[PDB]
Amino acid sequence: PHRYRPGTVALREIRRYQKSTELLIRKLPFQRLVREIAQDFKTDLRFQSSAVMALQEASEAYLVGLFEDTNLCAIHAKRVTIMPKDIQLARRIRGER
Amino acid sequence: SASHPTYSEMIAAAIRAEKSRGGSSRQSIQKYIKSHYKVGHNADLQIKLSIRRLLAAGVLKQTKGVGASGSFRLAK
């Protein structure tokens, strides 16, 4: 009957996944997502293997940088949890909108 | 025109009800004010203002806090 407090396994995951460079998103669903959306602009599209790998690296990097900026927004609100308010704020200051 | 006892006696009965060594917090008093007595919208205002008075005259005793933000206990 062993139970960890609330706020420790998350932190160990932080250190764990920050030390590792492996892709955190599953490969196959991301490819299918790319196919569906790409099917909007063109039909019967061929995609290089190296092309799909490039999309996943760029996406996770963009999201991680965003997650740091979102984390700062939540902390600036004297909050330990990130919320959609922080996301909408971070994107607005970035200029993406 | 709802009938209810004194606001100096209503906060006194709510400190007696729940025996906590740290004391009975003001916000818990309100729940006892509007569940055991019939009060209006103005209850929370006068409950705060009732704490303003009988806190300085010696009727109430501060334990961990400031004003009506922290806790208190009825002086013996």
Binding site: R5, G7, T8, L11, I14, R15, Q18, K19, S20, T21, A54, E57, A58, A61, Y62, V64, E68, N71, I75, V80 | -
Partner: protein
């Protein structure tokens, strides 16, 4: 004999001369311009490789991996400002946790 040896650079000055003429940058290319660029590229390349090399030896792994490259650039203020617009593939993130999150 070659111009790379004459300038004292490993990076090909001859290749840079060809690339400057065919890159539609100007009508004519100076004689000293491809030499200057080769020196600059080698210097900047050397800085990244040494900081990444120290990052490789700090991890007890001779061979440099993209993780070592990212650590070198982001920890250097000058290099981070220069590469602020560049994302390094398989670089990961610097292990950073704000102190407000840790319990006490």
């Amino acid at each position: 004999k070659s111009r790379s040896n004459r300038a004292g650079l490993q990076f090909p000055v001859g290749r840079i001369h060809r690339l400057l003429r065919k890159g539609n940058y100007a009508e004519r290319v100076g004689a000293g311009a491809p030499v200057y660029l080769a020196a600059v590229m080698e210097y900047l390349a050397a800085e990244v490789l040494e900081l990444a090399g120290n990052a490789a030896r700090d991890n007890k792994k001779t061979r440099i991996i993209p993780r070592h490259l990212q650590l070198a650039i982001r920890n250097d203020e000058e290099l981070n400002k220069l590469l602020s617009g560049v994302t390094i593939a398989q670089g990961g993130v610097l292990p950073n946790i704000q102190a407000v999150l840790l319990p006490k």
